[PDB]
Symmetry: D2
Subunit: 113 residues, 4 copies
């Protein structure tokens, strides 16, 4: 209740930070390049296809993850798709760290006892 | 300094200085200075602290171990100081979980757009 | 359809399912489910916790006017003998299988050990 | 522990299995091939380091992430190491599936019984 407002402030701050913009700018670079927005969708589709089989515990023979990984290096091949993946991971692990930092105060309290 | 990191340390300090944290901090202070509620508190910590590490080195844990714990927990709930704490303590933790969830929206929102194609 | 680990997993599912300790849990479940009162509380705490989950997952405020009672709800539930036993046995199982999940990881973890 | 016995049996089967054995094989062909084991050591350390930095909550500029993915990409180019990678992942996913199928009976009861 008291905290939320601080959270929305952080959400706004995040979304507005240069890093996140950079990321957005990169999504656009790819979305706007016929060539690149192809590869991306390809990876995306094989990725979602795997995730799904997994959510229902289905078998996934090596065939599959081999193609998966293939397509991914082909991905890290095209300039524009590369920075997107690069920036997306750095955004992905960075906000993951933000979240850890927020849990800090509570870990502090625990230490105390 | 990475802007986000800084914003997050900022977030940390705000939470610390917030009122609910201090409510919590003071709640701990209580059950810590009440010889009665402190023993139970402690008792519950260790039983729960031992079961943990017994699960890590993976070792069978009979019923009693859990009923003992389940019971030792109940009596702690029967305490006043401990309850206040046990609650503030839990709410704080869901509030936070919620905060970190908001931190994930900008990226959650963008991830969604990746489904555009 | 042929993956061995898959089939192996199906086997495990049935093994746990037919094991002696699972049948005990299920019987504890049956006790409560058949006895009106315990059943009642059981569903309250469920509904309660379900509501909270709903809220937090939706990102809404959760003043102690909720996490408070919910913590009570569990209280005079932790009491009902029938419902207590279920809760007890339930966790024994949660933990038991959790350990089982660990052992399965073993081989790949020993190999990751080498990898370094 | 009642299901413990059962557990060890699953472990035995798991490591004894054809797929677990080929994962071993694949790891062997890289350990004994200069080019791939050089590459493998390298990417394994980049990934070891990144993970260290995140635990420690340290910042991680895009450099590392770019430079890192550059490598993971070079690695997918080496047949030997490409196989290791793919098998290590397939085994990883599959084990996780084994784990989840295990909770299946308890979660099922806790939901559907009443």
């Amino acid at each position: 209740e008291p905290l939320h407002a601080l959270a929305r402030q952080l959400e706004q701050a995040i979304r507005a930070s240069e890093p996140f913009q950079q990321l957005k700018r990169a999504y656009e670079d790819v979305r706007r390049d016929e060539t690149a927005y192809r590869m991306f969708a390809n990876v995306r589709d094989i990725q979602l296809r795997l995730h799904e089989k997994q959510m229902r515990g289905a078998a996934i023979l090596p065939d599959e993850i081999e193609q998966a990984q293939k397509a991914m290096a082909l991905a890290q091949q095209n300039e524009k798709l590369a920075r997107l993946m690069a920036l997306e991971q750095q955004m992905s692990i960075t906000i993951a760290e933000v979240q850890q930092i927020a849990m800090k105060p509570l870990e502090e309290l625990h230490r105390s006892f």
